[model samples]
Target: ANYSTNDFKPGLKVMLDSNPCSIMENEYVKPGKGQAFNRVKLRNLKTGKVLEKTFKSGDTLEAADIVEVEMNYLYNDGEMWHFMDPESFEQIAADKTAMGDAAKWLKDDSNETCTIMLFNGVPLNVNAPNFVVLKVVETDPGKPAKLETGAVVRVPLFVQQEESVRVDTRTGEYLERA
Candidate 1:
């Protein structure tokens, strides 16, 4: 299943050591003095590990195919978070690490679908949609309120307690007029 580097795409999943890894970014790193190599940055699906792997320019790699599925995210029970397949209603468990950065924007009992990065038909990383709507659980009220922690985003003047706002999943920043 190894494919030429020329075929890589943004959402394609590639395998490393039989684990699922997604192509976060790929760059052709080569100076005029040395052999060119493809530097790949990947995020693991199960362990949520971010890593970098390098390959010669002509090397082939397995092209991981990923499918986006909708699931009802139940709740986190400390150790693991449970999800239910919307169509089948079957429950599946995934550890916090598996949730990776998506944990911040994921709300309880929310029915949402995320792109599951898979390699060789196995899950490598889980990515939520680019944008997500979340309620500001707790934050001090101050004009030009810069977020003390987490994603940096602007909230509307009317956005207050119990108000929901759309957040950029990639940067975890708040987006206005969502």
Candidate 2:
């Protein structure tokens, strides 16, 4: 199906540059008489990057075929990362491109399930929750080093060595004490 500029809406998915993207924002830019345009901010599901684009008011775009499913993170097999559908125990494999920086957020031992974006039954992207509380088990004198998930980040100088900290996986930045 084709989506016209008039049909643009936040959360709407569309195909851009052969990639699936979700509309983040849409602004109508109408210059008095010549032509009106729809300025939009969209996020690429695969790269997780927001892009700003514009379309003539009446322009149309093909809707992307994308699906979001909840799946539990299994283990990384060095080559591929595996996920399992909790309901049916169906397994799926995703490549590094799909997982992107999401690898940092994964905690194999935790029973956390992440949303996997699929394009035609194949994993196209891995979406991790924004935040997680991790135990900072070890910290070098220079700063934070290790977490329960084996991921590391920088923390405050006053932060205790073995304390729980709430962190954001997306940027690998420590948020605050938990």
Candidate 3:
């Protein structure tokens, strides 16, 4: 049920944040010439549950550890997911710290797909599929696709690259209805 301050009394049952909470008691504070201040505290009566969550808004951007390297998606053994550099012909280790949405596209033999944001050789965020314009700059690898902006995308192993494909950036999934 709903209530007004006129209906406020001890032990009044009401909903707050959609959770039915019975007001334990009601009190008010005001000074002789000061304004009224509300300090309503209600005890929640929802039962049989616990809550745990994670939260993010906008995004995280810190440039101090921002070293974007053009590392390609290579191979993953039981030990570490490896990325290779075309220019350097060097390799990097990314098994443990690279598991943040990086493993979804790790099922591949596509080079030039993943570039990593790094701090002293440690993988902080996988910048491979991060910011892309969904244009296939194609050089086929088991028919994998890349965007015109050069950010890599994984299309389903069907259809040709000349076709436009819608892509989801966060944890990149190529939308293929081919």
Candidate 4:
């Protein structure tokens, strides 16, 4: 189905210049006795970049080929990280570039699944849990806590190695002890 400028709204996913973009904001502007337009702020789903564009009234936009699935993080083979669909048991490999920042939060666990966003059957990005409980493998006082996925983030002075603590994966910061 096609979407017209009248359908413009925040959080609407549409294809913009062959890229998957999500509308962050939409403003309908019409001057007195002048042409009407919809000004939109979009965020590229793949790169996470913001773009501004204006569409004339009645203009149509193509729907993006996007899908979200819950998959388990399997393991990385130095080149690509592999994930498996919990329901189908189908496996997919994502390159390091596609993994992006989510690589740090991925633990090799079948039970711990994450939402993977795909564009045209290709993995675009992985959304990790907002808060992750990781064991502080190697960190001393005033040092960064090294998690299993090689994420190094500063923790509180009271946090120590071999201890479990909650971390915000988005900001890569320590939240609290788990």
Residue-by-residue lDDT tens digits, candidate 3, 102-145: 55444346453676766445775574565333446584633567
Rank order by lDDT, top first? Answer: 4, 2, 1, 3
Candidate with best lDDT: 4
Each candidate: RMSD to true structure? Answer: 6.0, 3.4, 16.0, 2.0
TM-score winner? 4
Candidate 4 lDDT by residue in tens digits, 65-143 = 8888988888888779898887799998888888888888876662457788888899888777788888888886656
Worst 10 residues of 4 by lDDT: 105-114
Q: If ranked by TM-score, best first, what sequence of candidates would result? A: 4, 2, 1, 3
Q: What Cα-based lDDT does every candidate model obtain?
A: 0.64, 0.84, 0.54, 0.85
Q: How high is the lDDT of residue 118 in model 4?
A: 86
In angstroms, how far off is 160's CA in candidate 2? 7.5
User: How accurate locally is residue 142 in candidate 2, as Cα lDDT from 0 to 100?
Assistant: 37
Candidate 2: the clashing residue pairs are none
| Candidate 2 per-residue C-alpha lDDT over 89-154 given as tens digits, one digit per residue, 9 for 90 to 100 | 999999988887777677666656888889878888887778877787788663856886678888
Runs in model 1 deviating more than 4 A are 2-68, 118-123, 142-158
Question: Model 2, stretches more than 4 Å misplaced?
Answer: 29-37, 47-52, 133-142, 155-166, 175-178
Residue 143, model 4: Cα distance from true site in angstroms: 2.7
